[PDB]
Amino acid sequence: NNKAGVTYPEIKLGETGKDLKATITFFNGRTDMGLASYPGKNWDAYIKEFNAMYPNITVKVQTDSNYADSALTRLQANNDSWDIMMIPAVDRSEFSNYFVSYGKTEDMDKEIKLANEKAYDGQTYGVATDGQTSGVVYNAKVFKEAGINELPKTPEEFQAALKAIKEKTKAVPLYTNFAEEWAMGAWDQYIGGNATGDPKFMNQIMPHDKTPFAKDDKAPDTHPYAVYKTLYDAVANGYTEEDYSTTDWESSKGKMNNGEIATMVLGAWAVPQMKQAGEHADDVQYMPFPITVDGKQYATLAGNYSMGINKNSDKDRQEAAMIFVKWMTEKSGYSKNEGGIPIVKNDDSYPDTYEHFKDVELIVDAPAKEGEEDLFADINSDSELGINNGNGKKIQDIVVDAANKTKTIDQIMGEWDQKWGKAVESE
Ligand SMILES: OC[C@H]1O[C@@H](O[C@H]2[C@H](O)[C@H](O)[C@H](O[C@H]3[C@H](O)[C@H](O)[C@H](O)O[C@@H]3CO)O[C@@H]2CO)[C@@H](O)[C@@H](O)[C@@H]1O
């Protein structure tokens, strides 16, 4: 939907669009970085640097809490109040209904990592702010006070860790952030590569499997089951916060930094935010999610939120926005301050955030089989599980079910399997 016909591979930073005078609006969920008190480089700091190269492209930022729903509402508004947003849970087959293409996916694949993540039909509609993994944020000082001198790598070792933390320390062993739906929905992030070591599990096995959530009796501490059982067991064993209904996200950052929370199950993007939330940065560390597959640990490599451009925006703003995105990708250093993997395609660097990952194999999810690019998304929709789509409510239900002992983890996963397998048959 490119009005200026300028594509991302064609943009020569500091040359292209130097004649443009426009104001563009950047809508994202980093409310922290919209504040003057951000304990790092905030948005204005980046924009000031961008303006040294493009002084006549004014970039303004808007941010919203509960971004996952606000962005969806903003797309329904169908207006010009934004030029760049972080793409929300829009299906691939709908990208071209909202966003401007950055180019052919085969061209963008020479420029960025993950060019086919936010893509459809050979066109790329999203550029990730950085590369992400999911793991566990943990306070190493708390871990030392509890006698834990090596990181758990399996679910049983993880629960034993939580038992030691609760026994020997005052830290909340694992904080759920139940009250944040996105924080609960983030458990979906662990069920593919992390849990199976198989890049083909998410997009090629799950849409052809009626029971992806059942326990794997050949390796019962692997596969999606083991992921969600970890959460179930943390709550049921009494290793989480006393009141799940009153969790608070912003204050949990400080509590992790000061050793009042021992672990939180979050992506790498969360580590600098909590390192910075207090004076004890060096106690806040990042570990692989504790699953091991045949002696090895794996982490899915997938994008953070991707930057998408409004097809409503006029010709000048579309191009200015593409120039800003390219500047964020190639120049800003944002990935390096926000716990990110750089998105420039053949940048092999990585922040110190991954210093416990030296033995971990990062694997990008395989795409769908040729011809089934929509099969997973359709199954997900029919089943209403919303896997990796923001449905945190299904995760909240586990916390409630575990805390109240109304259902076993197996009953819950069987219920998911019924809904998923019915959807699989429908499509
Ligand atoms: O699931 C989509 C996407 O989620 C990414 O993680 C997001 C969170 O979903 C959430 O939006 C979080 O918002 C925070 C923000 O980082 C900061 O802490 C601010 O103060 O508070 C808000 C919550 O109100 O931001 C992270 C990072 O964008 C990430 O897990 C992706 O891999 C994933 O696809």
Tab-separated table of C-alpha atoms and ligand atoms in Angstrom:
chain	number	residue	atom	x	y	z
A	1	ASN	CA	0.000	0.000	0.000
A	2	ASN	CA	3.049	2.169	-0.701
A	3	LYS	CA	1.959	5.598	-1.873
A	4	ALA	CA	5.489	6.959	-2.354
A	5	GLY	CA	6.769	3.783	-4.000
A	6	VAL	CA	9.855	4.075	-1.814
A	7	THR	CA	10.754	0.715	-0.303
A	8	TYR	CA	12.961	-0.124	2.675
A	9	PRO	CA	15.839	-1.726	0.682
A	10	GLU	CA	15.952	1.365	-1.467
A	11	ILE	CA	16.340	3.817	1.441
A	12	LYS	CA	19.798	5.380	1.734
A	13	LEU	CA	19.877	6.867	5.230
A	14	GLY	CA	20.982	10.479	5.199
A	15	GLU	CA	20.145	10.831	1.495
A	16	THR	CA	16.679	9.481	0.805
A	17	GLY	CA	13.860	11.742	1.929
A	18	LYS	CA	16.174	14.574	2.908
A	19	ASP	CA	13.706	16.918	1.174
A	20	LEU	CA	10.755	15.820	3.323
A	21	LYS	CA	9.187	18.093	5.911
A	22	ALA	CA	6.649	16.107	7.932
A	23	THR	CA	5.530	15.217	11.422
A	24	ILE	CA	4.927	11.521	12.129
A	25	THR	CA	3.361	9.809	15.127
A	26	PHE	CA	4.853	6.657	16.702
A	27	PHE	CA	2.359	4.681	18.811
A	28	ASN	CA	3.773	1.983	21.077
A	29	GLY	CA	3.428	0.255	24.444
A	30	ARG	CA	6.673	1.444	25.999
A	31	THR	CA	4.955	3.780	28.405
A	32	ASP	CA	8.089	3.699	30.544
A	33	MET	CA	10.133	5.149	27.686
A	34	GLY	CA	7.641	8.000	27.219
A	35	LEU	CA	8.624	9.331	30.640
A	36	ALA	CA	11.426	11.736	31.491
A	37	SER	CA	12.363	9.443	34.398
A	38	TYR	CA	13.082	6.362	32.247
A	39	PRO	CA	16.303	5.014	33.823
A	40	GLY	CA	17.899	4.683	30.417
A	41	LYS	CA	17.623	6.024	26.905
A	42	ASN	CA	14.005	7.111	26.375
A	43	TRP	CA	12.194	7.831	23.126
A	44	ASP	CA	13.132	11.516	22.981
A	45	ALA	CA	16.814	10.667	23.329
A	46	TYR	CA	16.531	8.407	20.300
A	47	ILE	CA	14.504	10.934	18.359
A	48	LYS	CA	17.047	13.663	19.073
A	49	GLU	CA	19.693	11.396	17.556
A	50	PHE	CA	17.484	10.645	14.555
A	51	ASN	CA	17.014	14.400	14.033
A	52	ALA	CA	20.785	14.905	13.717
A	53	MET	CA	20.411	13.029	10.401
A	54	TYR	CA	16.786	13.958	9.570
A	55	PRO	CA	16.084	17.299	11.260
A	56	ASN	CA	12.908	18.028	9.262
A	57	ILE	CA	11.206	14.738	10.134
A	58	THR	CA	9.500	15.446	13.444
A	59	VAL	CA	8.733	12.269	15.332
A	60	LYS	CA	6.148	12.338	18.115
A	61	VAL	CA	5.373	9.415	20.396
A	62	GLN	CA	2.133	8.236	21.919
A	63	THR	CA	1.998	5.332	24.347
A	64	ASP	CA	-0.745	3.307	25.966
A	65	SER	CA	-1.000	0.749	28.703
A	66	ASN	CA	-2.961	-2.354	27.755
A	67	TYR	CA	-1.383	-1.816	24.355
A	68	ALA	CA	-2.568	-5.127	22.964
A	69	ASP	CA	-6.171	-3.946	23.048
A	70	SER	CA	-5.595	-0.215	22.504
A	71	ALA	CA	-3.758	-0.869	19.219
A	72	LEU	CA	-6.572	-3.090	17.965
A	73	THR	CA	-9.022	-0.328	18.840
A	74	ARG	CA	-6.795	2.202	17.071
A	75	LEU	CA	-6.841	0.100	13.893
A	76	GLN	CA	-10.634	-0.082	14.041
A	77	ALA	CA	-10.685	3.726	14.279
A	78	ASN	CA	-9.332	3.718	10.706
A	79	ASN	CA	-7.771	7.170	10.792
A	80	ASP	CA	-4.503	9.110	10.658
A	81	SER	CA	-3.756	9.535	14.367
A	82	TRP	CA	-0.704	7.290	13.936
A	83	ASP	CA	1.896	6.549	11.265
A	84	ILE	CA	3.942	3.847	13.005
A	85	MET	CA	2.502	1.422	15.531
A	86	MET	CA	3.609	-1.845	17.045
A	87	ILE	CA	1.599	-4.386	15.086
A	88	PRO	CA	-0.956	-5.999	17.443
A	89	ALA	CA	-2.629	-9.420	17.163
A	90	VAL	CA	-3.663	-9.019	13.543
A	91	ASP	CA	-3.697	-12.156	11.406
A	92	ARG	CA	-1.126	-12.383	8.608
A	93	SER	CA	-3.811	-12.480	5.935
A	94	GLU	CA	-5.018	-9.080	7.117
A	95	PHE	CA	-1.738	-7.155	7.189
A	96	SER	CA	-2.315	-5.684	3.712
A	97	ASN	CA	-5.657	-4.359	5.017
A	98	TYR	CA	-3.875	-2.092	7.500
A	99	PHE	CA	-0.173	-1.646	6.855
A	100	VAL	CA	2.255	-0.487	4.170
A	101	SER	CA	4.561	-3.133	2.723
A	102	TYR	CA	8.276	-2.583	3.245
A	103	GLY	CA	9.111	-4.552	0.088
A	104	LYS	CA	9.298	-8.099	-1.164
A	105	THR	CA	10.101	-10.523	1.633
A	106	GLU	CA	12.976	-11.934	-0.422
A	107	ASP	CA	14.506	-8.454	-0.606
A	108	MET	CA	13.854	-7.632	3.056
A	109	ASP	CA	15.452	-10.968	4.065
A	110	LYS	CA	18.825	-9.602	2.926
A	111	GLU	CA	18.307	-6.554	5.176
A	112	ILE	CA	16.709	-7.752	8.427
A	113	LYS	CA	16.241	-10.829	10.536
A	114	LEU	CA	12.762	-12.324	10.643
A	115	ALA	CA	11.610	-10.829	7.358
A	116	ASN	CA	8.837	-13.461	7.031
A	117	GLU	CA	7.494	-13.061	10.584
A	118	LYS	CA	5.153	-10.142	9.900
A	119	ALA	CA	4.691	-10.958	6.239
A	120	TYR	CA	2.032	-12.286	3.867
A	121	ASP	CA	2.197	-13.515	0.309
A	122	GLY	CA	5.791	-12.485	-0.254
A	123	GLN	CA	5.551	-9.004	1.285
A	124	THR	CA	6.909	-7.847	4.628
A	125	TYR	CA	4.660	-5.565	6.687
A	126	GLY	CA	6.576	-5.490	9.968
A	127	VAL	CA	10.148	-4.911	11.172
A	128	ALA	CA	10.853	-6.096	14.707
A	129	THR	CA	12.303	-3.549	17.077
A	130	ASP	CA	14.703	-6.321	18.099
A	131	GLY	CA	15.095	-10.071	18.354
A	132	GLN	CA	13.644	-11.698	21.443
A	133	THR	CA	13.830	-14.887	23.415
A	134	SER	CA	11.764	-15.931	26.450
A	135	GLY	CA	13.303	-17.205	29.645
A	136	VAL	CA	13.272	-16.471	33.383
A	137	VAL	CA	14.363	-13.246	35.084
A	138	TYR	CA	15.812	-14.082	38.505
A	139	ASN	CA	17.658	-12.446	41.380
A	140	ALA	CA	21.048	-14.177	41.703
A	141	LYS	CA	21.631	-12.779	45.209
A	142	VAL	CA	18.371	-14.380	46.352
A	143	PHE	CA	19.436	-17.573	44.575
A	144	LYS	CA	22.726	-17.557	46.506
A	145	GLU	CA	20.993	-16.945	49.842
A	146	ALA	CA	18.847	-20.037	49.129
A	147	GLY	CA	21.796	-22.321	48.444
A	148	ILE	CA	21.168	-22.495	44.687
A	149	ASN	CA	24.545	-22.357	42.927
A	150	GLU	CA	23.530	-23.729	39.520
A	151	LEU	CA	20.511	-22.816	37.439
A	152	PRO	CA	17.557	-25.234	37.208
A	153	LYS	CA	17.244	-26.694	33.721
A	154	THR	CA	14.168	-28.950	34.155
A	155	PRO	CA	10.719	-28.395	35.702
A	156	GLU	CA	11.532	-30.523	38.761
A	157	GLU	CA	14.808	-28.644	39.318
A	158	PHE	CA	12.891	-25.399	38.955
A	159	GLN	CA	10.314	-26.342	41.579
A	160	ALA	CA	13.071	-27.533	43.916
A	161	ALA	CA	14.676	-24.104	43.407
A	162	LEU	CA	11.396	-22.403	44.341
A	163	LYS	CA	11.115	-24.658	47.391
A	164	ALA	CA	14.576	-23.597	48.541
A	165	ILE	CA	13.863	-19.890	47.912
A	166	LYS	CA	10.694	-19.984	49.981
A	167	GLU	CA	12.348	-22.006	52.736
A	168	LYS	CA	15.577	-20.027	53.148
A	169	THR	CA	14.624	-16.525	51.958
A	170	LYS	CA	11.854	-13.966	52.248
A	171	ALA	CA	11.559	-13.430	48.467
A	172	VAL	CA	8.329	-14.294	46.722
A	173	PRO	CA	9.632	-17.348	44.822
A	174	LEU	CA	7.737	-16.637	41.561
A	175	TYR	CA	5.552	-13.580	40.883
A	176	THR	CA	2.774	-14.270	38.404
A	177	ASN	CA	1.692	-10.766	37.400
A	178	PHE	CA	-1.703	-12.405	36.990
A	179	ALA	CA	-3.345	-8.967	36.774
A	180	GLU	CA	-1.520	-8.217	33.505
A	181	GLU	CA	-3.097	-10.259	30.754
A	182	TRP	CA	-0.064	-9.838	28.478
A	183	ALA	CA	2.148	-11.094	31.294
A	184	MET	CA	0.015	-14.208	31.589
A	185	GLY	CA	-0.284	-14.666	27.844
A	186	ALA	CA	3.490	-14.619	27.603
A	187	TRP	CA	3.523	-18.227	28.839
A	188	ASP	CA	2.507	-19.139	25.294
A	189	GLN	CA	5.977	-18.040	24.195
A	190	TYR	CA	7.697	-21.081	25.656
A	191	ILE	CA	5.666	-23.925	24.147
A	192	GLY	CA	7.338	-24.361	20.761
A	193	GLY	CA	11.081	-24.335	20.292
A	194	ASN	CA	11.840	-23.870	23.971
A	195	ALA	CA	9.732	-26.878	24.986
A	196	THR	CA	10.493	-29.212	22.082
A	197	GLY	CA	13.758	-28.099	20.465
A	198	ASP	CA	11.898	-28.448	17.135
A	199	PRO	CA	11.600	-25.387	14.889
A	200	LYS	CA	8.714	-27.097	13.046
A	201	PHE	CA	6.494	-27.623	16.127
A	202	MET	CA	4.655	-24.294	16.159
A	203	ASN	CA	3.654	-23.791	12.524
A	204	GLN	CA	3.873	-27.341	11.108
A	205	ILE	CA	3.082	-29.862	13.851
A	206	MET	CA	0.512	-28.036	15.998
A	207	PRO	CA	-1.902	-27.323	13.091
A	208	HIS	CA	-1.818	-31.092	12.322
A	209	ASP	CA	-2.084	-32.352	15.914
A	210	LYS	CA	-5.295	-32.792	17.884
A	211	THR	CA	-3.600	-32.944	21.252
A	212	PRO	CA	-0.516	-30.684	21.285
A	213	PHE	CA	-1.164	-29.912	24.960
A	214	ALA	CA	-1.190	-33.488	26.254
A	215	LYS	CA	1.678	-34.744	28.390
A	216	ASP	CA	4.415	-36.411	26.328
A	217	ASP	CA	4.935	-39.707	28.134
A	218	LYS	CA	8.229	-40.323	26.281
A	219	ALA	CA	9.530	-37.017	27.739
A	220	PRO	CA	7.020	-35.686	30.239
A	221	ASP	CA	9.169	-32.641	31.176
A	222	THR	CA	9.092	-31.342	27.610
A	223	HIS	CA	6.382	-30.043	25.198
A	224	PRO	CA	3.658	-27.492	25.897
A	225	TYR	CA	2.278	-29.507	28.804
A	226	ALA	CA	5.471	-29.079	30.820
A	227	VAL	CA	5.424	-25.331	30.276
A	228	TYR	CA	1.961	-24.781	31.648
A	229	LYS	CA	2.511	-27.369	34.403
A	230	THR	CA	5.416	-25.261	35.650
A	231	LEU	CA	2.966	-22.383	36.249
A	232	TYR	CA	0.358	-24.739	37.701
A	233	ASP	CA	2.868	-26.232	40.108
A	234	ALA	CA	4.385	-22.928	41.197
A	235	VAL	CA	0.922	-21.741	42.252
A	236	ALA	CA	-0.369	-25.016	43.674
A	237	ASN	CA	2.799	-25.711	45.646
A	238	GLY	CA	2.427	-22.308	47.309
A	239	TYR	CA	5.478	-20.693	45.661
A	240	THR	CA	3.781	-17.589	44.206
A	241	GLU	CA	2.448	-14.326	45.625
A	242	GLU	CA	-0.157	-14.492	48.385
A	243	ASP	CA	-2.848	-12.663	46.364
A	244	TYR	CA	-2.792	-13.106	42.609
A	245	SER	CA	-5.624	-10.641	41.992
A	246	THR	CA	-3.590	-7.689	43.233
A	247	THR	CA	-0.315	-8.105	41.351
A	248	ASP	CA	1.287	-4.923	40.040
A	249	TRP	CA	3.678	-4.829	37.095
A	250	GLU	CA	5.555	-1.568	37.567
A	251	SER	CA	6.299	-2.253	41.232
A	252	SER	CA	7.378	-5.855	40.444
A	253	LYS	CA	10.384	-4.452	38.580
A	254	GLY	CA	11.654	-2.871	41.748
A	255	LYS	CA	10.855	-5.917	43.828
A	256	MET	CA	12.876	-8.153	41.492
A	257	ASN	CA	15.746	-5.670	41.672
A	258	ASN	CA	15.667	-5.607	45.507
A	259	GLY	CA	15.312	-9.322	46.027
A	260	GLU	CA	11.741	-9.373	47.198
A	261	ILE	CA	10.844	-11.396	44.087
A	262	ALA	CA	13.113	-14.260	43.133
A	263	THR	CA	11.818	-15.222	39.661
A	264	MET	CA	9.505	-13.964	36.913
A	265	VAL	CA	8.779	-15.805	33.660
A	266	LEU	CA	9.428	-13.167	31.018
A	267	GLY	CA	11.368	-12.456	27.826
A	268	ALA	CA	14.830	-10.942	27.584
A	269	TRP	CA	13.303	-7.515	26.955
A	270	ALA	CA	12.393	-7.456	30.637
A	271	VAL	CA	15.931	-7.816	32.007
A	272	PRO	CA	17.259	-4.275	31.494
A	273	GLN	CA	13.961	-2.789	32.728
A	274	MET	CA	14.426	-4.587	36.042
A	275	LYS	CA	18.202	-4.122	36.185
A	276	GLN	CA	17.450	-0.380	35.935
A	277	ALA	CA	14.566	-0.382	38.423
A	278	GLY	CA	16.874	-0.265	41.381
A	279	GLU	CA	20.431	-0.076	42.581
A	280	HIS	CA	21.116	-3.832	42.361
A	281	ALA	CA	21.300	-4.234	38.570
A	282	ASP	CA	23.960	-6.937	38.814
A	283	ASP	CA	21.719	-9.254	40.886
A	284	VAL	CA	19.068	-9.280	38.113
A	285	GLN	CA	19.960	-12.050	35.672
A	286	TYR	CA	18.354	-14.026	32.881
A	287	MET	CA	18.156	-17.797	32.612
A	288	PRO	CA	16.811	-20.232	30.034
A	289	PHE	CA	13.365	-21.486	30.772
A	290	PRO	CA	14.004	-24.733	32.679
A	291	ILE	CA	13.232	-27.345	30.056
A	292	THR	CA	15.830	-29.757	28.646
A	293	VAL	CA	15.340	-31.839	25.524
A	294	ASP	CA	17.746	-34.809	25.193
A	295	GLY	CA	20.445	-33.108	27.200
A	296	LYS	CA	20.072	-29.744	25.424
A	297	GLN	CA	18.323	-26.444	26.002
A	298	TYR	CA	16.678	-24.388	23.281
A	299	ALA	CA	15.137	-20.959	22.927
A	300	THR	CA	12.796	-19.771	20.219
A	301	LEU	CA	14.091	-16.682	18.464
A	302	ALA	CA	11.149	-14.475	17.540
A	303	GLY	CA	10.561	-10.791	17.146
A	304	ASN	CA	9.722	-8.284	19.778
A	305	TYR	CA	6.753	-6.083	18.698
A	306	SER	CA	7.163	-5.156	15.040
A	307	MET	CA	6.898	-1.659	13.610
A	308	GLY	CA	4.060	-1.295	11.105
A	309	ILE	CA	3.180	1.738	8.981
A	310	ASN	CA	-0.361	3.144	8.500
A	311	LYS	CA	-1.740	2.825	5.021
A	312	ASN	CA	-3.974	5.779	5.903
A	313	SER	CA	-0.957	8.049	6.263
A	314	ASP	CA	-0.221	10.312	3.304
A	315	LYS	CA	2.643	9.823	0.873
A	316	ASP	CA	5.114	11.977	2.823
A	317	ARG	CA	4.365	10.446	6.213
A	318	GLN	CA	4.584	6.883	4.907
A	319	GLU	CA	8.083	7.545	3.553
A	320	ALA	CA	9.193	9.486	6.632
A	321	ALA	CA	7.952	6.593	8.766
A	322	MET	CA	9.828	4.023	6.672
A	323	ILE	CA	12.953	6.158	7.008
A	324	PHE	CA	12.454	6.257	10.774
A	325	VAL	CA	12.000	2.495	10.969
A	326	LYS	CA	15.147	1.906	8.954
A	327	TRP	CA	16.993	4.319	11.255
A	328	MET	CA	15.735	2.438	14.302
A	329	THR	CA	16.912	-0.813	12.763
A	330	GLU	CA	20.316	0.203	11.432
A	331	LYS	CA	21.337	3.100	13.653
A	332	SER	CA	19.574	3.586	16.940
A	333	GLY	CA	21.227	0.898	19.023
A	334	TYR	CA	17.862	0.279	20.656
A	335	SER	CA	18.282	-3.497	20.618
A	336	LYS	CA	21.525	-3.096	22.543
A	337	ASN	CA	19.971	-1.131	25.402
A	338	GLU	CA	16.649	-2.983	25.650
A	339	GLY	CA	17.906	-6.549	25.905
A	340	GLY	CA	17.410	-7.181	22.195
A	341	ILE	CA	18.998	-9.196	19.402
A	342	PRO	CA	19.872	-6.754	16.597
A	343	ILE	CA	17.578	-6.991	13.607
A	344	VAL	CA	20.063	-5.950	10.964
A	345	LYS	CA	20.331	-9.278	9.195
A	346	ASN	CA	24.020	-10.150	9.537
A	347	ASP	CA	24.735	-8.336	12.777
A	348	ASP	CA	25.953	-11.233	14.940
A	349	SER	CA	26.340	-9.218	18.148
A	350	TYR	CA	24.231	-9.804	21.258
A	351	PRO	CA	23.988	-7.980	24.589
A	352	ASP	CA	25.318	-9.307	27.868
A	353	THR	CA	21.702	-10.299	28.531
A	354	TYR	CA	22.541	-13.762	27.153
A	355	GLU	CA	25.550	-14.651	29.273
A	356	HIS	CA	23.837	-17.766	30.688
A	357	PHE	CA	22.857	-18.931	27.174
A	358	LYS	CA	26.262	-20.043	25.897
A	359	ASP	CA	25.048	-23.644	25.595
A	360	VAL	CA	21.502	-22.776	24.390
A	361	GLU	CA	20.468	-23.259	20.783
A	362	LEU	CA	18.337	-20.361	19.576
A	363	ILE	CA	15.943	-21.530	16.854
A	364	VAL	CA	13.605	-19.412	14.733
A	365	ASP	CA	10.272	-21.123	14.139
A	366	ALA	CA	9.948	-22.782	10.734
A	367	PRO	CA	7.229	-21.290	8.544
A	368	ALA	CA	4.089	-23.179	7.643
A	369	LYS	CA	4.279	-25.842	4.996
A	370	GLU	CA	3.850	-24.305	1.575
A	371	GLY	CA	0.116	-23.713	1.204
A	372	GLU	CA	-0.805	-23.647	4.908
A	373	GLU	CA	0.361	-20.118	5.781
A	374	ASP	CA	-3.069	-19.473	7.333
A	375	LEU	CA	-3.815	-22.916	8.846
A	376	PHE	CA	-2.388	-22.236	12.310
A	377	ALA	CA	-4.073	-18.821	12.550
A	378	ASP	CA	-7.462	-20.226	11.530
A	379	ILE	CA	-7.229	-23.090	14.043
A	380	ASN	CA	-6.177	-20.653	16.732
A	381	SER	CA	-9.219	-18.507	15.923
A	382	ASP	CA	-11.742	-21.341	15.881
A	383	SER	CA	-10.420	-22.860	19.096
A	384	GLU	CA	-10.365	-19.448	20.797
A	385	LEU	CA	-7.201	-20.446	22.629
A	386	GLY	CA	-5.394	-17.426	21.211
A	387	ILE	CA	-1.985	-19.115	21.359
A	388	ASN	CA	0.643	-16.386	21.303
A	389	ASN	CA	-2.149	-13.959	20.370
A	390	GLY	CA	-2.710	-12.179	23.678
A	391	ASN	CA	-5.259	-14.533	25.270
A	392	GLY	CA	-3.969	-14.338	28.828
A	393	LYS	CA	-7.345	-15.208	30.287
A	394	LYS	CA	-6.794	-18.916	29.580
A	395	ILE	CA	-3.540	-18.587	31.576
A	396	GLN	CA	-5.254	-16.724	34.410
A	397	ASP	CA	-7.671	-19.639	34.602
A	398	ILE	CA	-4.750	-21.987	35.365
A	399	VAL	CA	-3.639	-19.771	38.263
A	400	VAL	CA	-7.179	-19.752	39.633
A	401	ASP	CA	-7.626	-23.452	38.981
A	402	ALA	CA	-4.314	-24.257	40.674
A	403	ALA	CA	-4.813	-21.970	43.668
A	404	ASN	CA	-8.343	-23.310	44.280
A	405	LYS	CA	-7.659	-26.985	43.449
A	406	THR	CA	-10.754	-27.211	41.257
A	407	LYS	CA	-8.910	-28.828	38.353
A	408	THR	CA	-5.699	-30.739	37.680
A	409	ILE	CA	-3.274	-29.500	35.021
A	410	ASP	CA	-4.245	-32.561	32.983
A	411	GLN	CA	-7.942	-31.645	33.040
A	412	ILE	CA	-7.025	-28.159	31.815
A	413	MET	CA	-4.754	-29.406	29.030
A	414	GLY	CA	-7.342	-31.965	27.987
A	415	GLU	CA	-9.894	-29.194	27.737
A	416	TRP	CA	-7.501	-27.190	25.559
A	417	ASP	CA	-6.943	-30.326	23.461
A	418	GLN	CA	-10.679	-30.731	22.881
A	419	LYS	CA	-10.986	-27.139	21.690
A	420	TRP	CA	-7.831	-27.330	19.599
A	421	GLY	CA	-8.560	-30.695	17.985
A	422	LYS	CA	-12.090	-29.665	17.103
A	423	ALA	CA	-10.650	-26.583	15.374
A	424	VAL	CA	-8.036	-28.747	13.617
A	425	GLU	CA	-10.798	-30.891	12.163
A	426	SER	CA	-12.843	-27.836	11.110
A	427	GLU	CA	-10.001	-26.447	8.991
B	1	LIG	O1	3.130	-10.704	23.102
B	1	LIG	C1	3.508	-9.725	22.165
B	1	LIG	C2	4.962	-9.348	22.411
B	1	LIG	O2	5.120	-9.023	23.779
B	1	LIG	C3	6.383	-8.456	24.047
B	1	LIG	O3	6.458	-8.068	25.423
B	1	LIG	C4	5.878	-6.758	25.707
B	1	LIG	C5	4.655	-6.959	26.630
B	1	LIG	O4	3.593	-7.608	25.958
B	1	LIG	C6	4.134	-5.717	27.197
B	1	LIG	O5	3.534	-5.027	26.136
B	1	LIG	C7	5.305	-4.898	27.803
B	1	LIG	O6	4.721	-3.660	28.094
B	1	LIG	C8	5.335	-3.041	29.231
B	1	LIG	C9	6.626	-2.266	28.888
B	1	LIG	O7	7.694	-3.070	28.435
B	1	LIG	C10	7.065	-1.457	30.131
B	1	LIG	O8	7.348	-2.413	31.165
B	1	LIG	C11	5.912	-0.538	30.539
B	1	LIG	O9	6.320	0.143	31.651
B	1	LIG	O10	4.813	-1.325	30.896
B	1	LIG	C12	4.268	-2.090	29.793
B	1	LIG	C13	2.980	-2.825	30.261
B	1	LIG	O11	1.959	-1.870	30.525
B	1	LIG	O12	6.270	-4.656	26.849
B	1	LIG	C14	6.936	-5.875	26.363
B	1	LIG	C15	8.012	-5.424	25.374
B	1	LIG	O13	7.364	-4.775	24.234
B	1	LIG	C16	7.500	-9.439	23.749
B	1	LIG	O14	7.373	-10.536	24.680
B	1	LIG	C17	7.393	-9.997	22.317
B	1	LIG	O15	8.325	-11.060	22.009
B	1	LIG	C18	5.921	-10.467	22.083
B	1	LIG	O16	5.725	-10.840	20.767
